[PDB]
Write an enzyme that holds these catalytic residues in place. Structure first.
Site, PDB file in Angstrom:
ATOM      1  N   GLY A 154       0.846  -1.197   0.000  1.00  0.00           N
ATOM      2  CA  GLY A 154       0.000   0.000   0.000  1.00  0.00           C
ATOM      3  C   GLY A 154       0.881   1.246   0.000  1.00  0.00           C
ATOM      4  O   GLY A 154       2.095   1.152   0.170  1.00  0.00           O
ATOM      5  N   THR A 155       0.279   2.414  -0.201  1.00  0.00           N
ATOM      6  CA  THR A 155       1.046   3.666  -0.356  1.00  0.00           C
ATOM      7  C   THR A 155       1.934   3.989   0.859  1.00  0.00           C
ATOM      8  O   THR A 155       3.094   4.392   0.693  1.00  0.00           O
ATOM      9  CB  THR A 155       0.142   4.875  -0.692  1.00  0.00           C
ATOM     10  OG1 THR A 155      -0.869   4.472  -1.619  1.00  0.00           O
ATOM     11  CG2 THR A 155       0.954   6.015  -1.311  1.00  0.00           C
ATOM     12  N   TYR A 156       1.381   3.769   2.055  1.00  0.00           N
ATOM     13  CA  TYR A 156       2.033   4.117   3.307  1.00  0.00           C
ATOM     14  C   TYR A 156       2.928   3.001   3.895  1.00  0.00           C
ATOM     15  O   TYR A 156       3.592   3.225   4.902  1.00  0.00           O
ATOM     16  CB  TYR A 156       0.991   4.563   4.326  1.00  0.00           C
ATOM     17  CG  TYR A 156       0.153   5.778   3.960  1.00  0.00           C
ATOM     18  CD1 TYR A 156       0.565   7.064   4.331  1.00  0.00           C
ATOM     19  CD2 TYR A 156      -1.080   5.642   3.299  1.00  0.00           C
ATOM     20  CE1 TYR A 156      -0.209   8.180   4.031  1.00  0.00           C
ATOM     21  CE2 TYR A 156      -1.859   6.752   2.993  1.00  0.00           C
ATOM     22  CZ  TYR A 156      -1.418   8.018   3.363  1.00  0.00           C
ATOM     23  OH  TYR A 156      -2.162   9.135   3.083  1.00  0.00           O
ATOM     24  N   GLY A 157       2.974   1.829   3.260  1.00  0.00           N
ATOM     25  CA  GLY A 157       3.941   0.784   3.610  1.00  0.00           C
ATOM     26  C   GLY A 157       3.457  -0.629   3.313  1.00  0.00           C
ATOM     27  O   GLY A 157       2.395  -0.834   2.712  1.00  0.00           O
TER      28      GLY A 157
ATOM     29  N   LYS B 126      -0.450  -3.445   8.557  1.00  0.00           N
ATOM     30  CA  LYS B 126       0.273  -2.515   7.699  1.00  0.00           C
ATOM     31  C   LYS B 126       1.402  -1.878   8.503  1.00  0.00           C
ATOM     32  O   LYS B 126       1.145  -1.333   9.563  1.00  0.00           O
ATOM     33  CB  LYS B 126      -0.689  -1.436   7.247  1.00  0.00           C
ATOM     34  CG  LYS B 126      -0.091  -0.481   6.248  1.00  0.00           C
ATOM     35  CD  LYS B 126      -1.148   0.495   5.793  1.00  0.00           C
ATOM     36  CE  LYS B 126      -0.639   1.146   4.529  1.00  0.00           C
ATOM     37  NZ  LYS B 126      -1.421   2.379   4.238  1.00  0.00           N
TER      38      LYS B 126
ATOM     39  N   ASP C 194      -9.254  -8.181  -3.394  1.00  0.00           N
ATOM     40  CA  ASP C 194      -9.489  -6.744  -3.699  1.00  0.00           C
ATOM     41  C   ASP C 194     -10.167  -6.644  -5.074  1.00  0.00           C
ATOM     42  O   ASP C 194     -10.251  -7.631  -5.837  1.00  0.00           O
ATOM     43  CB  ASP C 194      -8.175  -5.965  -3.697  1.00  0.00           C
ATOM     44  CG  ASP C 194      -7.153  -6.458  -4.741  1.00  0.00           C
ATOM     45  OD1 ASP C 194      -7.267  -6.102  -5.916  1.00  0.00           O
ATOM     46  OD2 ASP C 194      -6.180  -7.130  -4.352  1.00  0.00           O
TER      47      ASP C 194
ATOM     48  N   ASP D 261      -7.649   8.952  -2.179  1.00  0.00           N
ATOM     49  CA  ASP D 261      -6.901   8.047  -3.068  1.00  0.00           C
ATOM     50  C   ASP D 261      -7.646   6.727  -3.389  1.00  0.00           C
ATOM     51  O   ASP D 261      -7.058   5.630  -3.357  1.00  0.00           O
ATOM     52  CB  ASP D 261      -5.505   7.785  -2.510  1.00  0.00           C
ATOM     53  CG  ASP D 261      -4.578   7.148  -3.575  1.00  0.00           C
ATOM     54  OD1 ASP D 261      -4.790   7.359  -4.796  1.00  0.00           O
ATOM     55  OD2 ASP D 261      -3.654   6.415  -3.180  1.00  0.00           O
TER      56      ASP D 261
HETATM   57  C1  LIG Z   1      -2.968 -13.772  -0.956  1.00  0.00           C
HETATM   58  O1  LIG Z   1      -2.733 -12.360  -1.056  1.00  0.00           O
HETATM   59  C2  LIG Z   1      -3.756 -11.472  -0.828  1.00  0.00           C
HETATM   60  C3  LIG Z   1      -3.748 -10.269  -1.515  1.00  0.00           C
HETATM   61  C4  LIG Z   1      -4.740  -9.323  -1.291  1.00  0.00           C
HETATM   62  C5  LIG Z   1      -5.786  -9.575  -0.414  1.00  0.00           C
HETATM   63  C6  LIG Z   1      -6.893  -8.569  -0.182  1.00  0.00           C
HETATM   64  N1  LIG Z   1      -6.951  -8.046   1.209  1.00  0.00           N
HETATM   65  C7  LIG Z   1      -6.352  -6.952   1.560  1.00  0.00           C
HETATM   66  N2  LIG Z   1      -5.544  -6.315   0.676  1.00  0.00           N
HETATM   67  C8  LIG Z   1      -4.984  -5.135   1.031  1.00  0.00           C
HETATM   68  N3  LIG Z   1      -4.122  -4.474   0.148  1.00  0.00           N
HETATM   69  C9  LIG Z   1      -3.601  -5.192  -0.992  1.00  0.00           C
HETATM   70  C10 LIG Z   1      -4.488  -4.761  -2.130  1.00  0.00           C
HETATM   71  O2  LIG Z   1      -4.386  -5.948  -2.885  1.00  0.00           O
HETATM   72  C11 LIG Z   1      -3.653  -3.117   0.445  1.00  0.00           C
HETATM   73  C12 LIG Z   1      -4.782  -2.104   0.323  1.00  0.00           C
HETATM   74  O3  LIG Z   1      -4.217  -0.799   0.566  1.00  0.00           O
HETATM   75  N4  LIG Z   1      -5.185  -4.546   2.229  1.00  0.00           N
HETATM   76  C13 LIG Z   1      -6.002  -5.197   3.111  1.00  0.00           C
HETATM   77  C14 LIG Z   1      -6.570  -6.414   2.825  1.00  0.00           C
HETATM   78  N5  LIG Z   1      -7.354  -6.783   3.874  1.00  0.00           N
HETATM   79  C15 LIG Z   1      -7.198  -5.816   4.789  1.00  0.00           C
HETATM   80  N6  LIG Z   1      -6.357  -4.884   4.329  1.00  0.00           N
HETATM   81  C16 LIG Z   1      -6.047  -3.643   5.065  1.00  0.00           C
HETATM   82  C17 LIG Z   1      -4.570  -3.338   5.144  1.00  0.00           C
HETATM   83  C18 LIG Z   1      -6.777  -2.423   4.506  1.00  0.00           C
HETATM   84  C19 LIG Z   1      -5.793 -10.778   0.263  1.00  0.00           C
HETATM   85  C20 LIG Z   1      -4.813 -11.733   0.076  1.00  0.00           C
END
Ligand SMILES: COc1ccc(CNc2nc(N(CCO)CCO)nc3c2ncn3C(C)C)cc1
Length: 272
Positions: free
Chosen positions: A13-16, A33, A75, A116
């Site tokens: 993500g943007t912040y880390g 995060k 996502d 964002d």
């Molecule tokens: C096997 O790998 C994966 C990959 C992606 C996911 C999807 N879940 C989540 N993906 C993301 N991010 C990756 C976007 O793809 C960062 C969003 O800024 N933040 C999350 C998630 N669930 C909670 N948070 C918080 C940090 C907000 C699941 C498993």
């Protein structure tokens, strides 16, 4: 960190960096995060809504800030890529749009902006829910024109513009404005919606990065921009993409738009 076992990196993500992790005591599976800011972040812990990813805990320690979030399994970017041959069914598009507008109506009522929004920050589960994550190369594709023109004091309208761009992409299966520099982003917007002027956006010509020497392009027809979206979807998209942030529809008013008269909550086909 000792209270959590990383299972895998899931993102930067943007912040880390973001990890899927398990709480050593609670057995809970979470997303971790790793990144004035203390007090603002603490206020986010209170902003709870069914369409906002829950922030469970803020851990400050040793030049590190960790944020512990509820974990979602997919996502929207990945789901869009997964659904590209067939397209996301219109009823699921409408349900996700409606839920996201509920999330934005909530945040905006508490005067919190995202700034964002992008498909990678919109998270889905097996029950048909979608949630807004991770409130604020960097992607410009969803950035509102007032941000691109140098307005410092932009408003909740910027999130409506990003969500309109994501609505169009769900429908067409192609990003609406895929800019690769600030100028290419602004010119892609102008080439599709027309170069803005004082008629459609009072004050535009006095914005910090506005230049009289910008090319003047004609607006294109929406029926050309998002086929095969119906007349209600196009009308709503047009109001989420107005140039003037003051004419742009609010999340609350969008929720009342005729496009949502038949909204439902379908279950998506998620392959985890
Ligand atoms: C096997 O790998 C994966 C990959 C992606 C996911 C999807 N879940 C989540 N993906 C993301 N991010 C990756 C976007 O793809 C960062 C969003 O800024 N933040 C999350 C998630 N669930 C909670 N948070 C918080 C940090 C907000 C699941 C498993």
């Amino acid at each position: 960190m000792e209270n959590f076992q990383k299972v895998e990196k899931i993102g930067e993500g943007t912040y880390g960096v973001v990890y899927k992790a398990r709480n050593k005591l609670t057995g809970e599976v979470v997303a971790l995060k790793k990144i004035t800011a203390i007090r603002e972040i603490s206020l986010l812990k209170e902003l709870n809504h069914p369409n906002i990813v829950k922030l469970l805990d803020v851990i400050h320690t040793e030049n590190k800030l960790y944020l512990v979030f509820e974990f979602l399994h997919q996502d929207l970017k990945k789901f869009m890529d997964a659904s590209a041959l067939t397209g996301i069914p219109l009823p699921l598009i409408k349900s996700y749009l409606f839920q996201l507008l509920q999330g934005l109506a909530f945040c905006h009522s508490h005067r919190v902006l995202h700034r964002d929004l992008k498909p990678q920050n919109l998270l889905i589960n097996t029950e048909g829910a979608i949630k807004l994550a991770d409130f604020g190369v960097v992607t410009l594709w969803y950035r509102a024109p007032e941000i691109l023109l140098g307005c410092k004091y932009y408003s909740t309208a910027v999130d409506i513009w990003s969500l309109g761009c994501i609505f169009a992409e769900m429908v067409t299966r192609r990003a609406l404005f895929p800019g690769d520099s600030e100028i290419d982003q602004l010119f892609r917007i102008f080439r599709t919606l027309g170069t803005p002027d004082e008629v459609v956006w009072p004050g535009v010509t006095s914005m910090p990065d506005y230049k009289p020497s910008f090319p003047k392009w004609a607006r294109q027809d929406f029926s050309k921009v998002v086929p095969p979206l119906d007349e209600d979807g196009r009308s709503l998209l047009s109001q989420m993409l107005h140039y003037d942030p003051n004419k742009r529809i609010s999340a609350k008013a969008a929720l009342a738009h005729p496009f949502f008269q038949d909204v439902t909550k379908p279950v998506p086909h998620l392959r985890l």
